[PDB]
């Protein structure tokens, strides 16, 4: 109970576009806030948009906090991280552009991150995917998973991760780069294909189509 | 309701010495936490001592947050201020070395700070007090109040106050110096002589003697 801090990345921009009357960011915001495990939500957003969340503060069963976004996604995470409760035992990082994450999937990834130290929701990639070299030739082989959010990580591990990133200088080029640099295991919790990220005009449509089905 | 953020200055050090079994800092901590007006307490303390407060987190009706102290009292306040809720309408700064503040006095100073923008609990000075010049001669005259805490201030005013202090460079030498520099009025709410600050060995004794009377 109340052991999880959520860092909600929400920094109109796509995540504030209404989906059946409700700004996209609020769907996942509410799904987390209903979970007894979740103590607090740190929303990382431009101050312009804070009222979208703060309107619901006395109606939700979590503490709401805010953090200013950074230039890169990892900067926004770090800013978020600085606001979580000092004794939270797990941090749950979520992209607000994924409004359709199911409670049941969040529960799974929370359990796996608690168990392993670091877990991310993933689905099996449907496309044929190949590594290609700098001569544009296929790197051959004789299973790939697409990562979603949440990403759930013990805060001490995330902090050592940042310390390593900051000090060395090492690059974040994809969304699981910090934990990779540690030699700590990262579990992939199987999610749902419905947990789409809303990027395009077209995605907005897909999300409405899924909220009605 | 839940419009007030308390900045509790608690950065053994005197404020952690037991008074009938309970570290001094917890007396005012609990008095504020029982007040419906109070949304959150930001405790400004060395991380060593955080557990003293965090033990009571699920038993109190406020959000608990922490801030790292600074070198001067005003630095500790500013650190505190950076952690309060973005829409809190009043900040209540209290010295944890004043464990005996009465709820009724806190209520008064909250009302006065809300009304005026800035209020502090005070009592009439009992001693004969004189201004003295640099030749050690009395500066003559043909009513003085001793300030206590809480100090209650609208956060926007406290922030402009800090902006002015930081930029100009002006000195804080006493405990109402920031608001003085503004030309905004500061109301003195009459408190109680029992609201002692625990400094000496002897004070510790006085506080026990007052908790029993
Ligand atoms: O923000 C980025 O772009 C990023 C780059 N790397 N990386 C990470 O390693 C993590 C930690 C994590 C990965 C997998 C499962 C749980 C936590 C995060 Cl939360 N963001 C990033
Ligand atoms: O920390 C100090 O030493 C200090 C120096 N000046 N000053 C202030 O003007 C205030 C603001 C205030 C004063 C009176 C009533 C309400 C708020 C505070 Cl809260 N601390 C200080
Ligand atoms: Cu898409
Ligand atoms: Cu004394
Ligand atoms: Na509204
Ligand atoms: Na205890």
Swiss-Prot record, chains A, B:
First and last residues shown, out of full length: 76 to 300 of 302
Pathway(s) it belongs to: Isoprenoid biosynthesis; isopentenyl diphosphate biosynthesis via DXP pathway; isopentenyl diphosphate from 1-deoxy-D-xylulose 5-phosphate: step 2/6
Tissue and organ distribution: Expressed in leaves, stems and flowers, but not in roots.
Biological role: Enzyme of the plastid non-mevalonate pathway for isoprenoid biosynthesis that catalyzes the formation of 4-diphosphocytidyl-2-C-methyl-D-erythritol from CTP and 2-C-methyl-D-erythritol 4-phosphate (MEP). Is essential for chloroplast development and required for pigments and gibberellins biosynthesis.
GO term, biological process aspect, one: isopentenyl diphosphate biosynthetic process, methylerythritol 4-phosphate pathway
Catalytic activity: 2-C-methyl-D-erythritol 4-phosphate + CTP + H(+) = 4-CDP-2-C-methyl-D-erythritol + diphosphate
Signal peptide stretch: none
Native organism: Arabidopsis thaliana (Mouse-ear cress)
Induction: Circadian-regulated with a peak in the late period of the light phase.
Transit peptide as UniProt keyword: yes
Recorded superkingdom: Eukaryota
Subcellular location: Plastid, Chloroplast stroma
The EC number(s) this enzyme carries: 2.7.7.60
Cofactor note: Divalent metal cations. Mg(2+), Ni(2+) and Mn(2+) are the most effective. Co(2+) and Ca(2+) are only minimally effective.
Entry GO CC: chloroplast; chloroplast stroma
Swiss-Prot/TrEMBL cofactor(s): Mg(2+); Ni(2+); Mn(2+)
Name used for this protein in its record: 2-C-methyl-D-erythritol 4-phosphate cytidylyltransferase, chloroplastic
């Amino acid at each position: 109970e109340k052991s999880v801090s959520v860092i909600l990345l929400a920094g109109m921009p796509k995540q504030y576009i209404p989906l059946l009357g409700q700004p996209i960011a609020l769907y996942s915001f509410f799904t987390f806030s209903r979970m007894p495990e979740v103590k607090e939500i740190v929303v990382v957003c431009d101050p312009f948009f804070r009222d979208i969340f703060e309107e619901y503060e006395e109606s939700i069963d979590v503490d709401l906090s805010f953090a200013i976004p950074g230039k890169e996604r990892q900067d926004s995470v770090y800013s978020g991280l600085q606001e979580i409760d000092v004794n939270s035992e797990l941090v749950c990082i979520h992209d607000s552009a994924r409004p359709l994450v199911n409670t049941e999937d969040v529960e799974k990834v929370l359990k796996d991150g608690s168990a392993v130290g670091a877990a991310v929701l993933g689905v099996p990639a449907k496309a044929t995917i190949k590594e290609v070299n700098s001569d544009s030739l296929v790197v051959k082989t004789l299973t790939l998973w697409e990562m979603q959010t949440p990403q759930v990580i013990k805060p001490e591990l995330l902090k050592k991760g940042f310390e390593l990133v900051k000090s060395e200088g090492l690059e974040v080029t994809d969304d699981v780069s910090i934990v990779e640099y540690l030699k700590h295991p990262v579990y992939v919790s199987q999610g749902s294909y419905t947990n789409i990220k809303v990027t395009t005009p077209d995605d907005l449509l897909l999300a409405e189509r899924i909220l009605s089905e």
